[PDB]
Amino acid sequence: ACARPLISVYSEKGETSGKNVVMPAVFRAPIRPDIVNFVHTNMRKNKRQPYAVSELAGHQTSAESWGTGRAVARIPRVRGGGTHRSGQGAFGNMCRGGRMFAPTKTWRRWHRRVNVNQKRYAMCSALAASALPSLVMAKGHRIEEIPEVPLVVDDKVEGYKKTKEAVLLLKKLKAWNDIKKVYASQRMRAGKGKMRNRRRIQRKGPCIIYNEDNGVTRAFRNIPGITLQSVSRLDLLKLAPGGHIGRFCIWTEGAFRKLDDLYGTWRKASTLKVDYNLPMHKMSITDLNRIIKSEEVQKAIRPANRKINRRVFKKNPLKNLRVMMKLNPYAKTARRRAIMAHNPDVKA
Amino acid sequence: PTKKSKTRKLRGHVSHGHGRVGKHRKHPGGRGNAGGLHHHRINFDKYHPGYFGKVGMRHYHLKRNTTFCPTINLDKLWTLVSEQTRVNYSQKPDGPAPIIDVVRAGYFKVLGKGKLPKQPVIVKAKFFSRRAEEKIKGVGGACVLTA
Amino acid sequence: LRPLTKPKIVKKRTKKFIRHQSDRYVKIRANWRKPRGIDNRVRRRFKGQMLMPNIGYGSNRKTKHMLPSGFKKFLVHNVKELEVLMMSNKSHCAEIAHNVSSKNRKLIVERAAQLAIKVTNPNAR
Amino acid sequence: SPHLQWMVIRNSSSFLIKRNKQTYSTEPNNLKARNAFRFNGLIHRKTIGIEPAADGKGVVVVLKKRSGQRKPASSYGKITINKNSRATLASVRNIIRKNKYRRDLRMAALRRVSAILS
Amino acid sequence: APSRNGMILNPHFHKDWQKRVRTWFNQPARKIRRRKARQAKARRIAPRPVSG
Amino acid sequence: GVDIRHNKDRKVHRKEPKSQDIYLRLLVKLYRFLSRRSDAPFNKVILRRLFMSKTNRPPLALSRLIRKMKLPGRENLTAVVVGTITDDVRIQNIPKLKVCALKVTDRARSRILKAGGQIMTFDQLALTSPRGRGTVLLSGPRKGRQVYRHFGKAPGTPHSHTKPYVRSKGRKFERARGRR
RNA sequence: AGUUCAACAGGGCGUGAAACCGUUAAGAGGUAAACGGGUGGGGACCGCACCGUCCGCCCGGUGGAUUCAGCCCGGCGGGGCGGGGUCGGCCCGUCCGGUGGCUCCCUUCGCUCCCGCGGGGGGUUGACGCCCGGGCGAAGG
RNA sequence: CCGAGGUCCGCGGCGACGCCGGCCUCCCACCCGACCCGUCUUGAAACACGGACCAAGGAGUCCAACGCGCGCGCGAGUCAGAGGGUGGCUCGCGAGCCCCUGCGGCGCAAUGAAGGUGAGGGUGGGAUCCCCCCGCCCCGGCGG
RNA sequence: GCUGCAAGCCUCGACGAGUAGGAGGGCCGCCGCGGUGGCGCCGAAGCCCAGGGCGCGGGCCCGGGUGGAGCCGCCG
Ligand SMILES: [Mg+2]
Ligand SMILES: [Mg+2]
Ligand SMILES: [Mg+2]
Ligand SMILES: [Mg+2]
Ligand SMILES: [Mg+2]
Ligand SMILES: [Mg+2]
Ligand SMILES: [Mg+2]
Ligand SMILES: [Mg+2]
Ligand SMILES: [Mg+2]
Ligand SMILES: [Mg+2]
Ligand SMILES: [Mg+2]
Ligand SMILES: [Mg+2]
Ligand SMILES: [Mg+2]
Ligand SMILES: [Mg+2]
Ligand SMILES: [Mg+2]
Ligand SMILES: [Mg+2]
Ligand SMILES: [Mg+2]
Ligand SMILES: [Mg+2]
Ligand SMILES: [Mg+2]
Ligand SMILES: [Mg+2]
Ligand SMILES: [Mg+2]
Ligand SMILES: [Mg+2]
């Protein structure tokens, strides 16, 4: 929460340009994969069109069951005639060409609404995951050579108007390897999804968040995988694809400044969103090894019992000798006085 | 969803979780709330007493805007003003007292449920309770009315 | 390429659990389905009938999924999914998938020989 | 906060391979390619990476630096040890033991050196 | 029909309600239809206020 | 065979938090280490409540927390509660509380901090007080939900005082035959 | 014979399952056939030294080779709350120093501006932006 | 070593696709066991019903509302719904983001047919925690 | 030395019938979508098999034949 370093703003050509921007508190918001997944599966459900079987299907015929009296199976059969259709099952779901069981109506609940606070919570946890090297590399993005995980670039990139100026920047920031992955991923979809305008499928690329659209959207259009989004309007479905957090976002300097005003630090609430602030943490020190091995907890735990106790196999004390004197030390004395009793010695 | 459904684990079982002796049929006990006096009387007289019969007078044209009378208690009375206002007049009890207009806050009647802090206060409400004004006079303050 | 150790892989039953009355009908496949009839002999486990798979037939936890050679099987599709078996090559053996081509199948066999990884189907094309 | 990040990579990861009742991880800084909080390579602040050299000769000991935490380009240091079998194992052993850098992966790293040298 | 403690439900679904069901699938497209009508009206009364 | 009934062999006790929360399961990994090695009866009670559901972890208002701290013998102890510390708007003063809970509402967090108080979390509690010394473990009104007003003998029995399930509380709704 | 990568694509012609049937190969057959458990015989396809119990660590001699090792000099790089190690900035939270103006709490007072009510200046903070070589947190880079 | 469950620092004949190995599957033989499934039924191998065989299709669904349990967000509040504002858009985007002098819904007060009226701690048990005394101590705790 | 996938590993003791019904687990299976990791004319899906195997089981993997263009693993 209070661990916010100073993020540098890399130039449009090479390394840092001397501009440093404080890390917004949004990147320190609680990372909640269970919130982002819950919101994603309800938001991605909100853009789909309804499908339905025609209500007239199956009932286009006039059929009355022949009933009891003949070897037929007592099912609605088509009226008499000279066709093959006459005498066949018409209405039941078991019958060929008949109605389906529970025809899919077009008024089912396609859309699900999420709480506005949970949509923002899922957005803060999705932005906080875009600031850790682990969650982004494990998301799938190849950023093993980028200069810094929060990739803040100068506002000059907002004025780009040609794709050659945009592809060169991604090669300078070593982010082109994340796009070469998109080219190698372009393939053909499996199954009957190719007949429904979803033939070619590919992978995702580095998202780019800007502030002013002076040509940024059209300069990064033709690059496969690039997703451009305004800083004020961030869609969770593109910043957390498939419900998984860790989208490699390329930030602009202008978008990084306003990012602290959209959601606000914990000290002062936001301004562009009335009555909103970042969610609090229910766990400040999220490092278990620092708490367990601390100077104050080791004084309260017992020494570790690292001696496993195997099952002691039970030998018969009556048959065995060394385990009888282990349970009864007198057994050796009582046995010697009995073995010696079988010795024919003469007394007084 | 359907993967978490119960029918997905009933494939193979014949009766589909509805018994073999008494098979699942179509309305074996009447539709809806039928038989509330004949064969479901033990259910209606045990969980819904008073369901059958009439009680009270009939109000033909009832307009809920006429009986509108939202109430407020004395414990939440100081919620209608800022927390700083409650303290700026708590230190100077020498006569300057804040005026709490309960009518302009969305309420009509004031009830004396909770305890009131010992500070002079003027309240403006359309209706007061007997104990509501007794606790305000005892703490210090007036109970003015508003039409 | 010997494994780390070859224990006595004891199996409580080597036969398959055949479905009831799957020898009298072609529609009844041999895939096991629990009989749930009210008067079924197999369900009531009469004497001399077909056996039902219980949890008692469970193999030893140390020898489960263990091939007769002593290794455990792991399906690979390329040389990248093969180098994960570099460590613990005494306990896991690679197995090239069936959809790979004979061109790339030879590359996995050559790379597995360097890393001392055993392949169950070395010469498959 | 490694323990916080492991609760997101333990089941949902791009490097996770689940098949044949086995689970492997394919991150570059994993010694035994095992999915565990001990061997995971892109989560901790001190990770040991051992890879073969550019050619067939040598061993590259990749170590994670201290200042390179949020900077992946300046986060790893390459150490190429093209020596005999004993000298390579002795150099890597002194890097881990005498620097106290990830001292729990000492023997696991020594067994990976002898595995890539063959 | 009742089994244990519960409410006495009165779902008014005894008519042929399935023939009279209005689905709000044109709700977002109706916002665009209303908005483009306000912009078209605005240009028609350009010097005059658009609210009325 | 042996003559024993297997009806109640399984003890139905939640041994793992049913929530997929990340920060909550990290506190479970912390207090499971203390419930085994600290040998303190406090950590064994916090571990149970980290598993319990939301209905078994009711809120704890400020007033209900202040009154339990003003009892004789609670001078400089901490008010531990596994749940949310909601604000009680009908109370006036806050007597320098030192609380520790999972969540604290925005107004309750402001009134506690403005009074000079201190708000902790269960990871800081296990750091400063591993044995649980100097703590006062509190709880909320578990039987305070509206759901428990319907639980009883039956609405239509003598001496019931059980709230019946009705659509709307009115005059023509279950008041005619059996309620007079 | 010919065309085609292919006629295991020859015209209701891609792929060509099951039921059923023909034929070939193998075996058997009086108490209908099948089935469970146990073993034996046979068959069809498969696997298995060439010293695969001479693999590996260490050790001791024999015999061919070592851009040959400890040690030392120079450069580079990295680790180091139980290295604090002495000097230093920087970010965030918090509390003071309120250090001086803008919102001020509906803060007390003076006041065009229509018939008592809505407007424009000065004096008073649990609040922002600044400053402290001012603290404090195993809060950080 | 009659001791926290086994080892041999014992050994023999064969080892070229054959004289070795597979026992699960294929065919056949023998011994023991063994009546046909589904279903209703107190009771089915039944002289109870359905089933000649094979393939494909074939039956617990969706909507409204309610109850309890659980996950999540905020919390005496909560939900922004109709609608409005738009990157001037909008290819993905009939999504998403933003705010409505939050109208209103459900809660924050009940009771009476109604006019109406309207809410001030004790005892017992009790997880947990606090304090005191006496011993031991590896000085952190332990025992009474 | 070995693990620490803590939703993991290890130790000990008792126990195991079951229709109607209830619950849990599934790295059992089918179609489609958002992520992700691949495979394919050096031969995909499907289909066939006296071939080699895994799981108590649902089923699955590999080899051979046939086929000629798409298909699959994991997290949701
Ligand atoms: Mg009709
Ligand atoms: Mg007939
Ligand atoms: Mg049809
Ligand atoms: Mg398909
Ligand atoms: Mg059953
Ligand atoms: Mg039935
Ligand atoms: Mg019934
Ligand atoms: Mg009956
Ligand atoms: Mg019904
Ligand atoms: Mg088997
Ligand atoms: Mg029976
Ligand atoms: Mg019933
Ligand atoms: Mg009953
Ligand atoms: Mg054909
Ligand atoms: Mg029947
Ligand atoms: Mg009957
Ligand atoms: Mg008979
Ligand atoms: Mg018949
Ligand atoms: Mg079918
Ligand atoms: Mg019920
Ligand atoms: Mg059982
Ligand atoms: Mg379908």
Side-chain angles (χ1 to χ4, degrees):
Chain A
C2 55
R4 310 225 310 258
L6 199 61
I7 301 301
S8 60
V9 180
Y10 287 86
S11 61
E12 71 287 346
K13 191 68 59 182
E15 63 282 358
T16 60
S17 59
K19 298 177 181 178
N20 292 328
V21 49
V22 190
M23 194 179 197
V26 190
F27 297 104
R28 298 307 173 189
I31 290 87
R32 295 286 306 274
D34 56 324
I35 302 301
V36 184
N37 182 30
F38 164 78
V39 178
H40 177 83
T41 62
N42 295 328
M43 277 176 45
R44 195 179 64 90
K45 198 179 301 180
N46 221 317
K47 63 171 57 182
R48 57 178 183 176
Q49 296 185 13
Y51 56 84
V53 178
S54 184
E55 57 175 7
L56 307 179
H59 305 305
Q60 297 279 9
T61 61
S62 67
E64 190 71 18
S65 176
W66 297 0
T68 272
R70 52 275 310 266
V72 305
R74 198 177 58 179
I75 181 82
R77 297 183 180 275
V78 194
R79 294 296 181 172
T83 80
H84 296 138
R85 183 60 184 178
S86 300
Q88 302 186 352
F91 287 153
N93 51 15
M94 71 219 67
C95 305
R96 172 185 179 273
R99 184 205 66 260
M100 61 169 296
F101 161 75
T104 62
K105 267 77 64 177
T106 185
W107 53 64
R108 55 198 287 183
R109 296 184 65 252
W110 303 100
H111 304 248
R112 308 300 164 88
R113 56 178 304 267
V114 200
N115 293 340
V116 189
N117 186 25
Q118 289 181 329
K119 296 178 178 181
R120 294 167 177 172
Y121 203 153
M123 186 83 271
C124 299
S125 300
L127 293 176
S130 176
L132 296 181
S134 60
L135 302 179
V136 183
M137 294 184 62
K139 176 60 168 53
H141 299 275
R142 309 191 71 261
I143 62 161
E144 66 281 349
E145 293 181 2
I146 65 168
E148 193 170 7
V149 171
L151 198 60
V152 184
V153 301
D154 190 69
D155 292 329
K156 175 184 172 59
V157 311
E158 292 180 349
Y160 287 171
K161 292 183 179 58
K162 298 188 64 178
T163 316
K164 289 189 176 302
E165 303 176 0
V167 63
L168 182 59
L169 174 67
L170 298 156
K171 297 175 180 295
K172 293 297 180 179
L173 302 170
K174 294 303 179 182
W176 184 246
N177 296 328
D178 197 12
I179 300 183
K180 293 178 58 182
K181 178 198 63 171
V182 182
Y183 285 106
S185 64
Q186 293 175 342
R187 59 190 174 274
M188 215 62 57
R189 184 183 290 271
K192 292 185 282 80
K194 297 180 290 296
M195 306 181 182
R196 303 174 181 175
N197 311 340
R198 297 164 314 208
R199 190 171 184 83
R200 190 183 67 175
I201 67 181
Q202 60 175 352
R203 218 174 292 270
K204 304 303 296 178
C207 182
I208 297 181
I209 290 88
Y210 60 89
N211 189 24
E212 296 184 0
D213 187 13
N214 300 16
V216 235
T217 53
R218 57 195 67 261
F220 293 90
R221 263 180 183 177
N222 220 26
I223 313 179
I226 298 292
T227 299
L228 300 105
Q229 288 183 326
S230 183
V231 59
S232 301
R233 311 184 179 192
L234 286 174
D235 190 5
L236 182 67
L237 307 182
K238 303 178 184 177
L239 226 150
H244 308 293
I245 59 186
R247 180 68 178 273
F248 175 47
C249 303
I250 301 180
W251 298 86
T252 316
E253 182 187 6
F256 222 67
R257 304 285 187 177
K258 189 182 292 298
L259 193 57
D260 200 12
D261 203 9
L262 289 166
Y263 309 93
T265 56
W266 290 278
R267 181 177 62 93
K268 52 182 181 179
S270 61
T271 307
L272 302 183
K273 298 177 174 57
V274 61
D275 199 339
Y276 178 75
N277 198 328
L278 290 178
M280 303 298 301
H281 292 260
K282 66 167 57 61
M283 184 180 183
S284 297
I285 311 177
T286 57
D287 193 1
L288 300 181
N289 188 89
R290 194 260 160 174
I291 302 296
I292 297 300
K293 305 293 298 180
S294 65
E295 311 88 22
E296 312 179 23
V297 176
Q298 296 292 335
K299 293 170 54 178
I301 61 180
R302 308 181 312 269
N305 177 26
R306 295 187 180 92
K307 192 64 177 184
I308 51 183
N309 301 122
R310 261 61 181 267
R311 162 187 169 182
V312 179
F313 195 71
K314 179 180 182 300
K315 303 181 175 184
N316 198 333
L318 306 177
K319 301 177 183 177
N320 221 20
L321 191 267
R322 293 275 298 278
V323 311
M324 168 58 74
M325 50 183 51
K326 176 177 173 57
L327 303 177
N328 184 21
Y330 177 70
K332 190 179 182 63
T333 299
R335 194 72 62 88
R336 184 186 299 107
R337 296 178 185 175
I339 299 172
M340 199 63 183
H342 290 57
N343 195 336
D345 52 356
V346 289
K347 309 297 293 299
Chain B
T2 318
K3 295 185 177 181
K4 298 183 179 181
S5 177
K6 186 185 175 181
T7 179
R8 283 305 122 193
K9 297 189 177 178
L10 289 175
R11 298 306 187 192
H13 314 267
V14 178
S15 297
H16 200 274
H18 287 278
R20 301 212 178 197
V21 185
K23 295 160 285 296
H24 186 277
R25 298 200 182 277
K26 312 179 60 183
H27 313 269
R31 284 187 191 252
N33 303 318
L37 288 169
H38 308 272
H39 54 279
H40 296 165
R41 176 192 292 260
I42 308 185
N43 192 307
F44 278 70
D45 295 7
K46 182 182 178 181
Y47 300 109
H48 311 92
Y51 184 86
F52 300 101
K54 299 181 180 179
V55 49
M57 299 179 297
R58 299 194 302 268
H59 197 350
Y60 287 155
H61 192 35
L62 178 55
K63 290 164 289 186
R64 294 300 176 90
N65 304 325
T66 309
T67 64
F68 177 78
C69 181
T71 72
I72 193 178
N73 295 319
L74 289 182
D75 53 7
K76 296 185 181 300
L77 180 66
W78 288 95
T79 65
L80 308 184
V81 298
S82 180
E83 187 268 353
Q84 305 176 12
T85 307
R86 200 265 301 177
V87 189
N88 288 130
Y89 294 100
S90 174
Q91 309 170 359
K92 317 299 288 296
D94 203 65
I99 297 180
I100 297 184
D101 196 332
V102 189
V103 183
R104 287 188 172 93
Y107 309 97
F108 284 179
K109 196 171 188 179
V110 174
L111 304 175
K113 176 183 183 302
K115 295 181 55 58
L116 201 63
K118 301 182 180 182
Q119 300 172 21
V121 52
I122 305 178
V123 286
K124 311 187 59 182
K126 309 183 66 176
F127 302 100
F128 287 96
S129 180
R130 203 199 82 264
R131 192 177 306 181
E133 65 162 2
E134 288 180 5
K135 293 186 178 181
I136 296 173
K137 299 295 177 57
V139 161
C143 303
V144 314
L145 301 179
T146 300
Chain C
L1 274 67
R2 302 173 178 177
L4 188 54
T5 177
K6 285 187 178 179
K8 182 180 178 181
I9 307 175
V10 48
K11 298 183 178 304
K12 304 181 178 181
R13 193 180 189 267
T14 54
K15 298 184 177 184
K16 295 288 295 295
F17 281 94
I18 314 295
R19 186 178 172 178
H20 180 41
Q21 275 187 337
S22 54
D23 56 311
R24 309 167 68 94
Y25 301 90
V26 191
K27 55 181 177 181
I28 305 302
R29 298 176 300 274
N31 297 332
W32 169 255
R33 269 79 173 98
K34 172 186 283 298
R36 308 183 186 277
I38 47 180
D39 298 330
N40 196 305
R41 301 184 297 176
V42 179
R43 183 191 65 84
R44 301 194 292 176
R45 58 174 71 95
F46 270 98
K47 181 175 61 177
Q49 305 295 340
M50 286 191 174
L51 287 70
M52 301 179 62
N54 302 326
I55 200 59
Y57 294 89
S59 301
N60 196 331
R61 296 175 63 183
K62 303 198 309 175
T63 61
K64 278 183 83 284
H65 305 291
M66 179 170 297
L67 303 185
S69 59
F71 292 90
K72 293 184 178 181
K73 191 166 57 186
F74 182 75
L75 192 66
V76 300
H77 301 82
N78 46 12
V79 296
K80 184 184 64 63
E81 293 182 2
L82 171 66
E83 300 180 7
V84 306
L85 298 179
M86 178 191 302
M87 303 264 77
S88 73
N89 52 13
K90 306 294 185 59
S91 305
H92 300 280
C93 63
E95 182 188 51
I96 321 176
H98 76 287
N99 54 11
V100 304
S101 57
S102 179
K103 168 187 175 182
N104 299 120
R105 184 184 296 268
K106 297 182 277 74
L107 299 182
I108 305 184
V109 179
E110 299 286 67
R111 184 54 183 175
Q114 304 174 1
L115 301 177
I117 305 178
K118 183 177 182 179
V119 185
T120 58
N121 46 11
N123 39 22
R125 294 295 177 91
Chain D
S1 55
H3 302 267
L4 183 66
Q5 304 173 8
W6 170 249
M7 304 296 298
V8 198
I9 319 298
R10 52 162 298 271
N11 193 18
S12 62
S13 183
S14 172
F15 307 95
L16 205 57
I17 296 184
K18 290 183 171 182
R19 70 171 64 98
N20 301 114
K21 280 76 179 180
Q22 302 167 19
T23 308
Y24 297 102
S25 196
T26 66
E27 59 259 352
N29 293 338
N30 198 329
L31 291 182
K32 291 187 177 181
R34 190 195 307 263
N35 183 35
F37 180 78
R38 179 189 176 188
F39 294 97
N40 196 9
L42 41 77
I43 166 186
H44 310 86
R45 288 184 270 96
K46 295 187 182 306
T47 61
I48 299 178
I50 296 182
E51 306 174 0
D55 55 327
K57 292 287 298 181
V59 171
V60 177
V61 181
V62 173
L63 296 181
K64 191 171 185 177
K65 301 178 181 177
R66 201 174 202 256
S67 61
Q69 293 299 143
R70 66 179 190 274
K71 303 177 181 178
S74 174
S75 186
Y76 297 140
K78 272 68 183 179
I79 300 176
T80 307
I81 305 181
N82 184 17
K83 296 180 173 59
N84 55 87
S85 302
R86 288 178 178 172
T88 311
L89 295 173
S91 300
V92 178
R93 183 177 52 84
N94 291 329
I95 290 179
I96 304 175
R97 191 165 186 173
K98 292 188 177 181
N99 286 339
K100 297 185 175 183
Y101 183 94
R102 198 65 173 181
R103 209 171 183 178
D104 51 359
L105 301 185
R106 180 253 303 177
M107 183 58 63
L110 266 56
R111 298 189 168 185
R112 187 174 181 86
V113 171
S114 59
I116 68 182
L117 286 176
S118 302
Chain E
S3 182
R4 273 174 190 90
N5 194 12
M7 288 193 181
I8 297 298
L9 305 173
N10 51 1
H12 301 252
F13 292 94
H14 299 253
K15 300 181 183 299
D16 201 329
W17 62 273
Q18 303 168 359
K19 297 184 178 302
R20 300 168 300 272
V21 168
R22 186 168 301 180
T23 60
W24 285 56
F25 292 138
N26 50 18
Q27 168 182 356
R30 196 164 68 254
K31 176 187 179 180
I32 305 177
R33 182 188 300 109
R34 289 191 177 105
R35 172 151 187 168
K36 290 184 177 179
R38 282 188 288 269
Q39 301 178 354
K41 174 186 178 183
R43 302 184 185 94
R44 180 172 54 89
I45 59 179
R48 307 172 180 87
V50 66
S51 59
Chain F
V2 62
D3 181 14
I4 184 62
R5 289 181 55 185
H6 308 77
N7 179 26
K8 295 193 174 185
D9 284 340
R10 283 183 59 256
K11 298 184 179 181
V12 184
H13 294 264
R14 185 172 295 191
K15 296 177 296 299
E16 178 182 1
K18 204 169 186 178
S19 68
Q20 301 295 336
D21 191 3
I22 296 307
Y23 296 86
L24 180 56
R25 285 188 173 269
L26 279 180
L27 300 179
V28 174
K29 295 178 63 178
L30 174 57
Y31 280 93
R32 276 178 171 169
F33 184 88
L34 299 175
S35 302
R36 293 191 301 102
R37 302 186 59 174
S38 176
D39 194 6
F42 176 82
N43 303 327
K44 301 176 182 179
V45 186
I46 300 296
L47 184 59
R48 312 169 191 167
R49 302 189 172 187
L50 291 181
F51 304 159
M52 300 180 186
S53 54
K54 182 184 175 183
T55 67
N56 295 327
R57 295 183 295 100
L60 183 59
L62 276 181
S63 59
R64 200 178 186 93
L65 192 150
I66 290 172
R67 298 186 312 168
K68 304 306 176 183
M69 291 301 110
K70 287 183 174 177
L71 303 185
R74 321 281 182 86
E75 306 289 67
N76 300 326
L77 309 183
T78 69
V80 180
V81 42
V82 191
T84 307
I85 300 184
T86 51
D87 180 21
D88 203 339
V89 207
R90 65 199 193 278
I91 204 180
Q92 311 299 331
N93 303 326
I94 290 87
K96 193 76 168 300
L97 296 174
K98 182 177 182 181
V99 303
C100 169
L102 293 169
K103 296 177 71 276
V104 175
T105 62
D106 296 358
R107 275 195 303 182
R109 181 176 300 274
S110 304
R111 300 179 68 180
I112 291 180
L113 287 181
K114 184 183 176 181
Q118 174 189 352
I119 300 178
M120 300 170 53
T121 50
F122 281 148
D123 58 353
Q124 305 178 357
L125 180 66
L127 175 63
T128 65
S129 299
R131 288 298 185 98
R133 296 176 177 175
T135 63
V136 183
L137 182 52
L138 299 178
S139 179
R142 299 184 55 169
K143 293 282 290 296
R145 297 190 303 156
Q146 186 72 16
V147 184
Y148 291 99
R149 295 184 181 181
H150 304 278
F151 297 157
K153 302 176 56 182
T157 58
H159 306 252
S160 58
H161 297 68
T162 299
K163 188 176 177 61
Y165 293 102
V166 296
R167 289 184 284 100
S168 180
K169 176 191 298 296
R171 176 186 58 88
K172 316 191 305 298
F173 303 100
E174 303 188 14
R175 296 190 184 278
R177 170 184 170 268
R179 308 306 295 265
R180 53 182 59 257

